[PDB]
Design a binder for these strands. Structure first.
Ligand SMILES: Nc1ncnc2c1ncn2[C@@H]1O[C@H](COP(=O)(O)OP(=O)(O)OP(=O)(O)O)[C@@H](O)[C@H]1O
Ligand SMILES: Nc1ncnc2c1ncn2[C@@H]1O[C@H](COP(=O)(O)OP(=O)(O)OP(=O)(O)O)[C@@H](O)[C@H]1O
Ligand SMILES: Nc1ncnc2c1ncn2[C@@H]1O[C@H](COP(=O)(O)OP(=O)(O)OP(=O)(O)O)[C@@H](O)[C@H]1O
Ligand SMILES: Nc1ncnc2c1ncn2[C@@H]1O[C@H](COP(=O)(O)OP(=O)(O)OP(=O)(O)O)[C@@H](O)[C@H]1O
Ligand SMILES: [Mg+2]
Ligand SMILES: [Mg+2]
Ligand SMILES: [Mg+2]
Ligand SMILES: [Mg+2]
Lengths: 264, 264, 264, 264
DNA sequence: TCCCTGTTTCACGTGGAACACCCT
DNA sequence: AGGGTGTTCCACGTGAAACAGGGA
């Protein structure tokens, strides 16, 4: 078995990584492929996006990382049979400090998620890592474990400057800890295609990275997640979009994305 | 003269800390008050919004915090004569580790920005601090220096959970490092007033904090930053809203906010 | 006992006079008051709305008006024991010529229904008259017999000229043949409260005649017949609504109107 | 030219005779065919639907009928260059009386409009006569003058029985005054296709007249004018649909009606 | 059989954004 | 260009109507 580990990371906040991670885990699970979703955000927004109470959460990914628990100990099962969740909690914040301690003694600790996943990388088809809004210790784990990264891009101004910096970190890890690391693609999120700022910022990213933009290679048209209030309602009902409204366009786009991920 | 030091912070990403910080700084500056805007985010989105190139930026608040530099050295003057900026860069990220080097050694380092600011706090009326989307060391400095905090709320689902944690952290620092700290107000931003998820999240937040909401005290009415494409186009021109589009509603909103802050 | 003789008239077609007449008669009959419903329309829409067969009906109000029959001869008893019907047929169309013959012969004939009615006017509590869509002879009789008039209003454009014109003709008779005639009230019908044309036409009519709009005198709110497919399904079963579907909103409306008419 | 005369008549009120007449005149005028539209209704709602004043109308179809005027004297020009209007006014009511005087002397007067129209039957391609909600003298004139009749049917209950009666009158004229008379078709109006009452009355009327239903010769499919609030606003701006909102479904439908009429 | 609640589909109103005139 | 004007597109909310188990 070969888990593809796809890290949904992007250091910018509010750009759709928790909406993308949760909902791709879902929309790929319905393709009857076994999905594990890691919640690497100390806010634990993905955990709650699937209906859990972080407050009624005993053991989570932190204790796996430091070795106090096996990752197979913490996995929870979700309302979707094919989607299982490694939940998160505020305790994951501690990991920041933890990380630098290894940085002081043996320059490891980028690869803690790498080791924590090693024991289930054959039990799942896809392991999707929802990353927190930083380029800090946690995000670096997320990338180091990963086969590829999915980059949610909200076509507003700062996502210009932001992206290159992120890619910079990628290359750095591509020369340092994770050689295999590929960009699985760029994913426009919250898309409003008729705004002019969006036309411009998309055009810029096209210029530097059109080859990285997700196309449903079935019809080749670009796959962009539409701004959908329904997409932002779905976690409130402890549900993906698939279980909350399978016919809304948020869902259509995230299933199209899953199709594209699958076609190769 | 004694600057009110006001941190626009919130640990959730994309919620308007940077947009509110830039545009409150500007909308107060035109009111003929001398403002310093600190960019406490390694993303340097506030710097970038005022038209600078982070990449053609020499020394920043990082070198201030490590003592290599004076806070008064790094200040740049902006296209508004009354608004000054302390810029940022990824080097500020390094502070993460620097902070914990204090936590291991003498359990301070909460109050670093407080001390570096000490030398410019009488040279300004308001010091407006744009925070990063975390509860880590940087936001801890950002809050601890501050007299009061402005909490921009994106009225969607997670604004529920997050907010409670944020205030608790506020309460925590009030009982440890900054006892004088006040909540200046909550700030609904990107407001689509007719959406149902918004009505709901506003209702919950009203029940728990209705009095802490920015009111146009002339009419008592709520002050809410409307979703406005122009509010998000303006930094692509390195301009605040009032220099980019003074008549749009994003702008009118921020000047009502600024007026409210001045009235007390 | 002195039956109030209430004419539901309006010169525009399809505005609910036949639906209002049937359903007010029924909603008052359920209040244990004895009601006679005159079908003054050669279409005999009120007749068939109560389940009779215009074709298997022998003698009708025509032969009453020409004296060939007593008004007490043509009355049929209906599916409601307290509701009686003077039925109609196409032969009532003949009366047009006949009217002008009286116009030619003794300058009466507006008051023919009045005369034909004299023999049943104390035998009923309310005598409810479904008028045809004109200001011609039949409607002139119908107003001339009547104590008061109920004007069903379809809140579209032509209700504007139309309304004031109907009121005009009312005043004419009030100064000539039937001065006692009172406007029992105005009744918005088929009411869709959110359409903009309705808002506009209602606002116009309000400015000119708000005091005439039927109010739930219990709660003072307006009485408006909601658009109810069932209100239009009921006559196909030869039934009023309260015999058809008493919990529907059309039904509650007509009963609220009935309460209002009795309430004073 | 040989003017086709199409009388839009049906005795039930509020079934679309006037919205249909006005709008077919318009949708036919735009095929660059010369249209003369008679307002044969004393309410003259067709006149007022074309932006004219009953208040500003000097000579109208009444004075033509009594011979005091030429039809060519009263014709007006409309905002559409290929559509001209013979307007109406409440004085047309007088014609009722007029008709019976001839019934008393030489049993003519069905053929008054026929005679008045005699002078423009080569100057127009189509002359469209909007009838009042009666089977009275005017409606009979309109049918007698006309080559064919267009019958708007609102698929509710009373338009079941009503239809049979109307056809009877056709046959009467077809046997007495007007042998050429054709039913150009039945035209479903205010159509709500998913209501069950509408399905049913359609099914019934299909049963009896399935061959009389207007087919868009393009798809063979039935042409049924949808409930369109915009179709009902159009007279408030003195305009047809095609000048007021040419892309709404009201307009497309009245245009399809125009094409079907044109093919023959 | 009488009822009661979850879903669909559809028109219409609303308010934002782009765009094209248009003043002048 | 700057500073109105209205026209076109789209998402979302609403509320009515047909329908469908589900219910003993
Ligand atoms: N395509 C979309 N349309 C509408 N709303 C969306 C869309 N994608 C995401 N959202 C909403 O945007 C808000 C934040 O997005 P989300 O948390 O998924 O991004 P994030 O980067 O994970 O945030 P953070 O970095 O703070 O964890 C939520 O309300 C989310 O539901
Ligand atoms: N009132 C508003 N209307 C429309 N767009 C807005 C508004 N406020 C902010 N935005 C936009 O939303 C995007 C994210 O917002 P912004 O970066 O101001 O929030 P933030 O707090 O800076 O994010 P971070 O949390 O990472 O600092 C930006 O393109 C910004 O222009
Ligand atoms: N409030 C309502 N909701 C729904 N349908 C209605 C309503 N009121 C009337 N209708 C329907 O509209 C159609 C015509 O209304 P109705 O015939 O009662 O008015 P009318 O004055 O009788 O017409 P006429 O002017 O020819 O006598 C009927 O099938 C009727 O059932
Ligand atoms: N397709 C439609 N959708 C919505 N409203 C409509 C439609 N057609 C007509 N109406 C409106 O319903 C009302 C009456 O229709 P209209 O007067 O054309 O029928 P009518 O037969 O002319 O009435 P009359 O029998 O008194 O002549 C008007 O306000 C009319 O514009
Ligand atoms: Mg998240
Ligand atoms: Mg920021
Ligand atoms: Mg009637
Ligand atoms: Mg008419």
């Amino acid at each position: 078995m070969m888990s593809e580990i796809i890290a949904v990371a992007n250091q910018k906040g509010g750009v759709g990584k928790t909406t993308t991670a949760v909902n791709l885990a879902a929309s790929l699970a319905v393709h009857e492929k076994k999905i594990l979703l890691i919640d690497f955000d100390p806010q634990a927004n993905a955990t709650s996006s699937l209906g859990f109470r972080r407050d009624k959460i005993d053991y989570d990914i932190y204790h796996v990382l430091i070795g106090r628990k096996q990752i197979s100990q913490v996995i929870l099962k979700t309302q979707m049979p094919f989607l299982d969740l490694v939940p998160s909690n505020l305790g994951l914040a501690g990991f920041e400090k933890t990380f630098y301690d290894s940085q002081d003694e043996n320059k490891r600790g980028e690869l803690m998620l790498k080791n924590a996943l090693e024991s289930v990388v054959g039990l799942y088809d896809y392991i999707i890592i929802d990353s927190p809004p930083a380029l800090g210790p946690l995000t670096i784990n997320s990338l180091s474990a990963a086969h590829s990264v999915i980059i949610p891009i909200q076509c507003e101004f700062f996502a210009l400057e932001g992206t290159k910096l992120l890619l910079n970190t990628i290359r750095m890890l591509q020369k340092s800890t994770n050689p295999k690391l590929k960009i699985r693609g760029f994913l426009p999120t919250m898309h409003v295609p008729q705004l002019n700022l969006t036309k411009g910022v998309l055009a810029e990213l096209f210029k530097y990275f059109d080859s990285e933009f997700f196309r449903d290679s079935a019809t080749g048209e670009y796959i962009m997640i539409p701004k959908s209030v329904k997409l932002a309602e779905s976690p409130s009902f402890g549900k993906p979009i698939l279980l909350y409204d399978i016919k809304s366009n948020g869902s259509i786009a995230y299933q199209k994305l899953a199709q594209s991920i699958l076609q190769g």
